[PDB]
Amino acid sequence: AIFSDRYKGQRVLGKGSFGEVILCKDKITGQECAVKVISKRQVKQKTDKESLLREVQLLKQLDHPNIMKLYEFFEDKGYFYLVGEVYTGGELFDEIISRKRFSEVDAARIIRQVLSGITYMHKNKIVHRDLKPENLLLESKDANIRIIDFGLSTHFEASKKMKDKIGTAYYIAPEVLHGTYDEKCDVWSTGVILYILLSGCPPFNGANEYDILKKVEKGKYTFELPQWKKVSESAKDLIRKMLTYVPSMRISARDALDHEWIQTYTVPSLDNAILNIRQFQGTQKLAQAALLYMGSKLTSQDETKELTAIFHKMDKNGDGQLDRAELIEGYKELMRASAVEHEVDQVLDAEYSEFVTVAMDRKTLLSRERLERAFRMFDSDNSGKISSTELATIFGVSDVDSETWKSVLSEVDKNGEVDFDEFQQMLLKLCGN
Ligand SMILES: Nc1ncnc2c1c(-c1ccc(Oc3ccccc3)cc1)cn2C1CCCC1
């Protein structure tokens, strides 16, 4: 069976773990679906085909209101296609940062759902392993949470590219790092999220990946921050049970559901936590957009040169001009079909050198507008500028050498703060331009 025989692409939803996710639509029923497309090139399998197929098969049979429903699985030469239900309420944290009030009641209601889903999957012997806020989609303000990506980390080796690793270190259980992990690792990650929901700061933090992993490996954290004063003791107690180092001594998903805090809270507003979550979230999203911008730029540069050499070879009259059919055949060649023809017609609606420019810009702006937007979001004072402290944090999360970005900053900030355009120049310099 062919994926494109049944489904057509509509919109790109974004980059997710192990692959990009596309909103697709059934050619018969008009049923909208979300599809994760995994490139066999970019991702190494950890298991045999049989084990993966069987997990897929089980997943298709599983049903829980807090777990993303998987419908279908496809495989071709270079790709796996995992087709499941579309959720439209976006990521939990984005909704949370746009709230008047947030209390232990809200956090308890969130955690109940997460725990219920986790409990269900653990009963079925399935571990997430890479569980984080971005894995938590809302179904549609009271709408249920659907956990995405369950079952992937067992069959696929985690990417080494920083673009994909962004923000994972905060949430990963220590025993996962060492290779000996079980279902309790999902409890740890869930413990970290609760900690953030109640303080707006990760319990294990740092200026870069390794500093965070180092705090995680050590296992120590505190409720020292002033804002923990406005938080019940039973919540903090649950965190302690969830953030227990040894997994055998760590509370199960099921027993967490019965905990005093979950029972009781399913009352003042934690304003500081909201402010810290908003700062935290903006930072992670800006760092991420920044890395994605550099990546799209390079990919663009690569494809720009490759497409030019194709359009040059196709110019068998040597004039620099070409017709529509040539462009289509060339664009098809770059990838080596309805989606290409449509894309071509959109560009043409907007001399092959001019075509290359606009076409690539049409990728340069998915990430350019995400970048501008994340920048404006981050600049909550609307000052138009970023401080050196803020830069350090962003590049540190981006894992860009402190001395390297400082260097680049020196060439542009010849005169202690940067605007958006400077920041973007910094990034261009940081990708060989
Ligand atoms: N189904 C979805 N609906 C809405 N958004 C989704 C998804 C999915 C998604 C991803 C993979 C997938 O495939 C599997 C999921 C779980 C287990 C196995 C495969 C199903 C849905 C990701 N996202 C993301 C992309 C970035 C932000 C929102």
Automatic annotation (TrEMBL):
Disulfide bonds join C201-C431. Its cofactor is Mg(2+). ATP binds at K36. InterPro entries: CDPK_Ser/Thr_kinases (IPR050205), EF-hand-dom_pair (IPR011992), EF_Hand_1_Ca_BS (IPR018247), EF_hand_dom (IPR002048), Kinase-like_dom_sf (IPR011009), Prot_kinase_dom (IPR000719), Protein_kinase_ATP_BS (IPR017441), Ser/Thr_kinase_AS (IPR008271). Ca(2+) 2 binds at E351, E354. It is an enzyme of class 2 (transferase). Its EC number is 2.7.11.1. PROSITE patterns: EF_HAND_1, EF_HAND_2, PROTEIN_KINASE_ATP, PROTEIN_KINASE_DOM, PROTEIN_KINASE_ST. Residues 7-262 form the Protein kinase domain. Ca(2+) 1 binds at D315, N317, D319, Q321, E326. CDD domains: EFh (cd00051), STKc_CAMK (cd05117). Belongs to the protein kinase superfamily. Ser/Thr protein kinase family. CDPK subfamily. This is non-specific serine/threonine protein kinase. It comes from Toxoplasma gondii. The lineage of its organism: Eukaryota, Sar, Alveolata, Apicomplexa, Conoidasida. The gene is CDPK1.
